């Protein structure tokens, strides 16, 4: 299954909803107490996701026994006020007595929105920030962008993403409130990959520390390999454990710990979201690399020069009749990169029944050092 | 996983290959003994499928013990001559001493190409008929079109399909040969659905006989439900048995039986391919129909009027707070005292129940399904 479903994510600052207003797109109108229901109606959006901060517990006198029971109380009460039965993402946020780190909101939305994209078979995403307050809008937008980027690359599909906002404040039903398309982008597997790597490669040298042993070095290295089309490396240098550990890290509930005067909320720093997106995209490349798979990777996941270099190397390999035993490419015909990841002294080739494979074999440590 | 892989299917009449020529697309050239290798190079196509007839068995002195062994001899010997290691579809065909029914070639290509599409995560398909002979081109093109139609609708994705043919060289030795895009189409889930139903609904009254009990009526009836957006009916009237039995029928090898100077080949009549496509598409609609699922079905699998009527009825339903006990739509929406299926886009008020469970509102025909079925 593949899927062409649409979804709208909406940042809602007040789970009680808002004064009824008449929203409008292209002259067509829909009256609502929340912009997201108007976007859903006017754009015929399949799925709805309301994003709330844990801080709105205060509105309903929800208890702080633990994050899960607190968020369940929020959802039960908001469903009745908003007339939206599902789905809800209730994220760690900083607001009044609720204390923490704003980037934790980002991490949480990235991870939870990614899971939703997987489940829903999505090809079009709307992000409605009409009712967001403080930093909700900027961080939900960027966290969802990251999730759609990871999703498009791993699922190998195109996903359209649009940012919407309106201004219903101090208006009523006699007011017409336009829902504006602010920006619309198309994310392809290539541009999803490039966004994910971009978010690793523009961070300071210590940014990815304490994620796993030597993560401070391993993470930017894996990102550089992904960014430059080193598919054989992504296939052969196992990162499945890193991915599993990050899933474990992000799957656990935030901690809610009440003070005298405060509720402290602890989730995971942004570096965990960026790292997960990286290893999630890398998981696309698992398994042995035969020539047609590599041709496809070149077309799908490499920029134009890198694609051309890889395809030229493959063209050269396809001129020869290939045997069962493994030989270095040299035996048939900056160096790592000038040959698009197939340097002749550092890559083997072999034929196993109907496929020719390229592998670094026991030379992978040499390759790793040149990344 | 979804996928944006490309694939070319090539009808090849002679597994020995052809006079080498320089194929060209848009000024760019590639010399080959087979058009499909030039297409693969010039259009950077991920996957290659060579379609051969079983009749090429004699080229390599292949034995006729059974279809599997004959096909495997053909494939192993063709690989070296053609320079293509995989994949091969070796189909029943009629030619010279090989006798049978030409539509069996269609059925075989449909089913086997469909399996290949599923495995390969495809969004772009090329059909190269350059080296096809007799009816290979017409039947491969139409069989593949049906396959992609079924695949697009069931997987819910768009697929582009293009028919290519080189300049025919005839009995001459040309030097440069253009590879022409003849036809290029885009198949959406809706376009796939409509092509599948079209192939059912343009057949004679008895065309679908002997597939399963009362299939002459049941098949057209399912196609009519699908063609007209009766998604609740498709969700509630079983067709998984029909799908399973068709997949079992089609997965069995063709029968090859040599006689005095003839080899008779038997596969399955075209009706099995068309019926398989139908039930494969219908299998998309499994599960209870909650209103968001229905809205999605209207947006994805229904023509403009049907989409509008369904969405209108859903808009009305969504005004109400829904209880957990099943009630007819009319119990919510119609007064006591006086005041049909298609005018309500499949949600007639006296024949459809509604209820809410675990955050979703559902519509179902429940015990009224027979009455709905009478009206299809
Ligand atoms: Mg949540
Ligand atoms: Mg075959």
Curated annotation (Swiss-Prot), chain A:
CDD domains: Csx1_III-U
InterPro entries: CRISPR-assoc_Csx1_C (IPR027419), CRISPR-assoc_prot_DxTHG_CS (IPR013383), CRISPR_assoc_ribonuclease (IPR052875), CRISPR_Csx1 (IPR010171), Csx1-like_HEPN (IPR019016), Csx1_CARF (IPR053857)
GO terms classed as biological process: defense response to virus
Subunit description: Homodimer.
Broadest EC class assigned to this enzyme: hydrolase
Keywords, alphabetical: Antiviral defense, Endonuclease, Hydrolase, Nuclease
Pfam families: Csx1_CARF, Csx1_HEPN
Description of activity control: The RNase activity is stimulated by cA4.
Family: Belongs to the CRISPR-associated Csx1 family.
Organismal lineage: Archaea, Thermoproteota, Thermoprotei, Sulfolobales, Sulfolobaceae
EC numbers on record: 3.1.-.-
The name this protein goes by in its record: CRISPR system endoribonuclease Csx1
Role played: CRISPR (clustered regularly interspaced short palindromic repeat) is an adaptive immune system that provides protection against mobile genetic elements (viruses, transposable elements and conjugative plasmids). CRISPR clusters contain spacers, sequences complementary to antecedent mobile elements, and target invading nucleic acids. CRISPR clusters are transcribed and processed into CRISPR RNA (crRNA). Activated by cyclic tetraadenylate (cA4) to endonucleolytically degrade linear RNA; when cA4 levels decrease the RNase activity of Csx1 is abrogated.
Single GO MF descriptor: endonuclease activity
